[PDB]
């Protein structure tokens, strides 16, 4: 359990969310932008990803899982600023993947916004 894991981020258009887990995903720790006193619409900032990443990573503490090999799963503004701020914790980011859900034209998306 020590120094082996998968880091999941999915920054949407709001509220960059990060959950770090082991290599066979079991949700070791997680944090958000709402868990740092960002109430609303400040969460869609790269500066919100500057603190939300390591405050789940450094407050994991159960096994010393200190490698991540992060996974990106969202179109957001704080996308690459959550892995740049992950080496502020310094956890040897070794395999970056953009695993985002892309449909094969499957379902009907919602209405246009006037």
């Amino acid at each position: 359990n020590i120094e082996n894991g998968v880091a999941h981020i999915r920054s949407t258009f709001n509220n960059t969310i990060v959950t770090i887990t082991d290599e066979f995903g079991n949700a070791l720790s997680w944090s958000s932008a709402g868990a740092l006193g960002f109430k609303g619409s400040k969460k869609s900032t790269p500066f919100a990803a500057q603190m939300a990443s390591e405050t789940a990573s450094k407050s994991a503490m159960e096994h010393g899982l200190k490698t991540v090999e992060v996974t990106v799963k969202g179109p957001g503004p704080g996308r690459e600023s959550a892995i740049r701020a992950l080496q502020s914790a310094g956890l040897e980011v070794t395999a970056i993947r953009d695993v985002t859900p892309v449909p094969h034209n499957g379902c009907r998306p919602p209405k246009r916004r006037r």
Partner: protein
Amino acid sequence: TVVRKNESLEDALRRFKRSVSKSGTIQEVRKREFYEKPSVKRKKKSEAARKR
């Protein structure tokens, strides 16, 4: 899905920023933010082809 090692993190990003821009992820989900009408994408693709 590309592994980048034997370097820093500020150079693996430079690989990853252009390994996403040369992919149908960001231009695909920006297209499907809202349902467009089934005859206005045929003109949207026509404007994105006549300009090339």
